[PDB]
């Protein structure tokens, strides 16, 4: 499965769920979270996130672990998500930022 991290945080740009061929992905507040079960590992989204936030499971940086079984967690109980959306508003502002978790909207 692919996995999204902690630049996506404020940022939620959605460009990675256009490319999606089997829409796998979930939407939070300020946050999107890839479905482990339903992801097939194309591949093809990890180009496309602007904040450089989605990795194989497998290639997740180590600071960053929390974010495979998150992405499980919340796949569950978030909306579904399969189009284009504009970013969120500060994006830019938070691209970047490091240790965005702490702002994670449920
Ligand atoms: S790796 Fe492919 S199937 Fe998985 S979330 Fe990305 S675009 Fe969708
Ligand atoms: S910022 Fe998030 S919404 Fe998708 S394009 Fe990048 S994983």
């Known amino acids: 499965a692919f ?13 990675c769920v256009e490319v999606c061929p089997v829409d796998c992905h979930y939407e939070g507040p300020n946050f999107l979270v890839i479905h482990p079960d339903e992801c097939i590992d194309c591949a093809l989204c990890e180009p496309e996130c602007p904040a450089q936030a989605i990795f194989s499971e497998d290639e997740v940086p180590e ?12 796949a569950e ?4 998500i399969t189009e284009k959306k504009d970013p969120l508003p500060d994006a830019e502002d938070w691209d970047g930022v490091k240790g965005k978790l702490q702002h994670l909207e449920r």
């Open 3 to 15: 996995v999204v991290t902690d630049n996506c945080i404020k940022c939620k740009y959605t460009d």
């Open 63 to 74: 600071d960053m672990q929390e974010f495979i079984q998150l992405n499980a967690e919340l």
């Open 77 to 80: 109980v978030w909306p579904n």
